[PDB]
Amino acid sequence: STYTQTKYPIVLAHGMLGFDNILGVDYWFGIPSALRRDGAQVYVTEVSQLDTSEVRGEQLLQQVEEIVALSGQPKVNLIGHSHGGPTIRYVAAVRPDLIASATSVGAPHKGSDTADFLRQIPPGSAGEAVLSGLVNSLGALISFLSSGSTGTQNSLGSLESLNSEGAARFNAKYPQGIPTSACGEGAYKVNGVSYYSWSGSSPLTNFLDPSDAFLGASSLTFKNGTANDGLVGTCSSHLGMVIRDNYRMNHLDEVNQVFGLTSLFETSPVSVYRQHANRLKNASL
Ligand SMILES: *[P@@](=O)(CCCCCCCC)OC[C@@H](COC(=O)NCCCCCCCC)OC(=O)NCCCCCCCC
Ligand SMILES: [Ca+2]
């Protein structure tokens, strides 16, 4: 069909400790295939696993400029998951002429309580040195298995961009589509760029999924019934037009992980992306 055929190409931007494809396994499990099936031009980008939103954004910018100046398409439709959120926002804020839309999926725009929890580790301590060194090792491994290089790994920069303080510093510099209120919506269209967002509210969805143990445990860093996906709060995930911030999905189900094991009492995450590509096509993007 033509159901997902957008005028401008769909560009997928991964989150922290993310990748494009590792030996056949997609980060966006069954999403590029399902989008391409009904007409969408999909480009899966690879950005630095662990670094600041600005560095990651600058890398994505170069790739977006390469996609525009090669495919002969003026603008592109950006879709970012988790850290992919503030990363696509950098690109949309500095170069709005090249972006038709910026959609965030489970993105901690106003911070992650899990990242805020990690601030308990004293700066410059032994614990910081070993936590950063270890996460840097994991990012280095993900980069090698995906691209063939260690890359430059800066987990302290990821965590700073993902905590409430650093996210607020980033939001001050690039305010486009960010809600002025704590949990409302942001401006739908700023500088020719349409802003959208969605997320999930259920840390536990499928007991067969190994990641549900991690996401359920990490959800406990969110106190006072703050609705979250295990790592990101619903209110924090708001950007522009909120489709739904309450899907029965955890942080990984948002990208149809692990291996498509999601809630059966909810519609497929794949279908959400397909409906979104259609919404963008109907918005003449
Ligand atoms: P987002 O960018 C930012 C969310 C808020 C951040 C919390 C700061 C916490 C450090 O999220 C996208 C990421 C989620 O990654 C994680 O926090 N998970 C770390 C689990 C790791 C550690 C223990 C193993 C130790 C050796 O989504 C992903 O990184 N990617 C998924 C892997 C998918 C492949 C699945 C198949 C696995 C066989
Ligand atoms: Ca899952």
Side-chain angles (χ1 to χ4, degrees):
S1 289
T2 54
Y3 188 76
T4 62
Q5 198 177 160
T6 39
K7 178 191 268 222
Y8 300 128
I10 292 174
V11 177
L12 300 178
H14 67 74
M16 159 206 231
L17 291 176
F19 55 97
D20 62 349
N21 189 277
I22 287 179
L23 299 166
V25 182
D26 281 314
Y27 172 93
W28 311 83
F29 200 74
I31 289 151
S33 54
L35 281 179
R36 277 169 189 148
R37 198 222 177 257
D38 289 310
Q41 278 294 298
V42 183
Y43 292 86
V44 196
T45 59
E46 186 148 90
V47 113
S48 190
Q49 281 69 37
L50 298 161
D51 217 330
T52 72
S53 303
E54 296 198 286
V55 173
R56 279 171 41 102
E58 189 56 42
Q59 288 171 328
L60 182 62
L61 179 52
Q62 294 301 296
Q63 281 177 74
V64 165
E65 283 175 338
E66 172 153 77
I67 287 156
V68 163
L70 248 88
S71 77
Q73 285 282 174
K75 286 171 169 277
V76 295
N77 291 299
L78 293 178
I79 296 179
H81 176 245
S82 200
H83 202 182
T87 298
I88 59 169
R89 278 171 49 221
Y90 176 90
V91 186
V94 303
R95 287 300 294 275
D97 53 305
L98 306 177
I99 310 307
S101 66
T103 307
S104 66
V105 189
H109 299 303
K110 289 174 179 179
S112 168
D113 286 44
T114 323
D116 285 349
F117 188 88
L118 296 165
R119 287 191 296 194
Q120 286 181 110
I121 303 163
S125 67
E128 189 190 52
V130 312
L131 174 97
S132 69
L134 222 147
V135 180
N136 277 341
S137 293
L138 183 47
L141 176 61
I142 295 164
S143 187
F144 180 72
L145 295 178
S146 195
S147 55
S149 173
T150 284
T152 300
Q153 255 52 265
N154 180 24
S155 67
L156 293 178
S158 287
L159 271 312
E160 182 54 36
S161 298
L162 300 169
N163 69 52
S164 67
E165 176 261 296
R169 261 72 198 269
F170 186 82
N171 294 338
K173 204 174 173 180
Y174 310 100
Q176 297 91 328
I178 290 299
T180 48
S181 71
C183 203
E185 295 190 300
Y188 292 9
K189 200 199 228 85
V190 192
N191 302 321
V193 182
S194 294
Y195 290 91
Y196 304 93
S197 74
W198 89 74
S199 202
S201 60
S202 297
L204 300 171
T205 54
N206 203 305
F207 51 95
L208 290 173
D209 196 317
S211 65
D212 267 53
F214 179 75
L215 295 165
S218 66
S219 83
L220 308 168
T221 59
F222 286 83
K223 37 194 67 179
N224 285 309
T226 305
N228 64 99
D229 65 22
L231 294 174
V232 177
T234 49
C235 293
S236 177
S237 79
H238 288 192
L239 185 72
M241 193 196 307
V242 184
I243 309 309
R244 265 189 75 183
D245 63 2
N246 69 333
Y247 277 115
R248 189 165 282 106
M249 285 178 208
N250 59 36
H251 204 61
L252 286 214
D253 293 320
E254 283 152 27
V255 280
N256 201 29
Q257 291 283 7
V258 184
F259 303 133
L261 294 168
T262 58
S263 181
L264 223 41
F265 306 89
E266 180 58 80
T267 60
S268 182
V270 175
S271 299
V272 186
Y273 283 94
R274 283 169 50 77
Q275 283 152 21
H276 195 51
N278 184 237
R279 174 161 44 235
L280 295 172
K281 177 225 177 79
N282 288 350
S284 62
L285 308 178

